[PDB]
Design a protein around this ligand. Sequence first.
Ligand SMILES: CCN(CC)c1ccc2cc(C(=O)N[C@H]3[C@@H](O)[C@H](n4cnc5c(N)ncnc54)O[C@@H]3COP(=O)(O)OP(=O)(O)O)c(=O)oc2c1
Ligand SMILES: CCN(CC)c1ccc2cc(C(=O)N[C@H]3[C@@H](O)[C@H](n4cnc5c(N)ncnc54)O[C@@H]3COP(=O)(O)OP(=O)(O)O)c(=O)oc2c1
Ligand SMILES: Nc1ncnc2c1ncn2[C@@H]1O[C@H](COP(=O)(O)O)[C@@H](O)[C@H]1O
Lengths: 300, 68, 102
Amino acid sequence: SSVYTTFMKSHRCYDLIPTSSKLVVFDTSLQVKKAFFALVTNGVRAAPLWDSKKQSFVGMLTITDFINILHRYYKSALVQIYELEEHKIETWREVYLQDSFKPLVCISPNASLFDAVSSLIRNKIHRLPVIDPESGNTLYILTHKRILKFLKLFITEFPKPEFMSKSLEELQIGTYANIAMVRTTTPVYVALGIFVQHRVSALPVVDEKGRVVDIYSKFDVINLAAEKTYNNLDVSVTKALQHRSHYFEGVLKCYLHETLEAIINRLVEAEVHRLVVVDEHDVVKGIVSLSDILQALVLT
Amino acid sequence: GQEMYAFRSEERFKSPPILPPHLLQVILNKHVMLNHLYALSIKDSVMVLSATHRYKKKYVTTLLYKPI
Amino acid sequence: MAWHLGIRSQSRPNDIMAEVCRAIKQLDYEWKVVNPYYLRVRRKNPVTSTFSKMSLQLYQVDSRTYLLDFRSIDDEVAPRPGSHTIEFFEMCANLIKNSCTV
Ligand SMILES: CCN(CC)c1ccc2cc(C(=O)N[C@H]3[C@@H](O)[C@H](n4cnc5c(N)ncnc54)O[C@@H]3COP(=O)(O)OP(=O)(O)O)c(=O)oc2c1
Ligand SMILES: CCN(CC)c1ccc2cc(C(=O)N[C@H]3[C@@H](O)[C@H](n4cnc5c(N)ncnc54)O[C@@H]3COP(=O)(O)OP(=O)(O)O)c(=O)oc2c1
Ligand SMILES: Nc1ncnc2c1ncn2[C@@H]1O[C@H](COP(=O)(O)O)[C@@H](O)[C@H]1O
């Protein structure tokens, strides 16, 4: 128990929703190719899935879905199987588990922010629909990014716990072993395979000396839905990153010996999902993600 | 007694009411329009329906993508 | 993105009304005629057993063109079936599909 735990347990999910927001919903009989293009066109990262037959929300369509489908699409094409691209949402969902069956994870606007964080961690998820039980409507999609920002802003800097002044290395927040990375020349299809195997939301791009020069993330993946690519998956990650060659400073990094406070501050101010942990010479040592931060704040 | 007569206004509803200038036909994306249905032009057999609804103090604009 | 309020038609106002009224009947919705261009519509959901309410209003936007407006009506962990907003969209869709053609 701390000033963070107290705050989270005494605030409702309702308090986090902006005055005005946009929500994209897909009927499950919609074509997959059309759904992912709708994500891009609407500037949105996820969409609740509506099953008309059941008159119910049954899941979410995210970039992780897109990664998995593209990976399967690429391998099937080399073996002359072409289905997915004319798959509807229900058929794609039927493919991947199907009893193995995963129900929709959601939360009430009146439930605590504590329960929201707990649900994200437990379910290994980044998108938590806030659903009003009276009307059944989805109001908002809650995220790590939004939650951390809220915490940073509405908690007074003081009554400050001792652990805020402690370094990442002291507190062991982040991942510092078996880091999923790609090289400058690594083809996109290989990168997708790495995404699927490690269930990770970003890949650092490194040179021959293991120094980070860029980052390949979920933002870069849905761009393949914008451009009518689907074909040129054999190109390098670098070529795929040309869509943002201009207007790009560099990768946001941190060091092992920075305080939790400084890193929370950097993550919030930058509006980014992770920092690449690096040494004196920009060699990748690990990743600290919003996932690690919120897991640390909820348990300590 | 004498037969009685009927006076009917008739033309009060001969034409539908004109759209009041506060309700606008087109929104670019790119008040109280609350609860009103909006739509994109149908493209490639898909319809996009849209509306804005209030929950307490919050407004959400929902878009439904739905095949014909 | 250009968003359009309801749907537009150049068909006769009385023919628009008669046709939405027939479509309502064919769909098993309840309705009330508030005035000749204003209808309240009520539906029992086949799956959920809950009720959905909306309004239909016809407007004239120019000398040959009319506008049909649809407005949802406000009443009074795994999710249960149902969503007022989505069901509103589905009512509208079903009504359009069964009353008119492009
Ligand atoms: C070996 C067979 N196979 C390969 C063909 C499989 C098998 C299983 C899956 C499952 C997926 C999934 O679940 N993705 C997604 C998504 O569909 C689902 N999900 C997200 N939010 C959810 C919620 N609130 N409730 C329920 N589910 C939610 O969880 C997965 C993780 O997404 P995420 O929350 O990390 O979002 P993000 O992608 O980071 O925006 C998926 O993309 O691909 C799969 C492929
Ligand atoms: C009008 C000018 N223009 C047209 C060309 C735009 C318009 C919009 C964007 C949006 C971007 C973005 O949303 N990136 C993404 C991403 O490229 C970047 N980012 C994430 N982690 C980073 C890190 N560790 N270091 C550096 N960057 C990181 O920050 C943005 C937010 O991503 P995210 O943290 O929500 O999750 P994701 O990285 O997508 O899994 C972006 O990069 O470039 C843009 C250019
Ligand atoms: N490239 C990566 N390699 C290894 N682990 C990662 C990587 N990116 C994120 N993680 C870890 O995986 C968990 C979820 O990460 P994220 O997908 O960023 O929420 C967190 O513990 C991260 O530190």
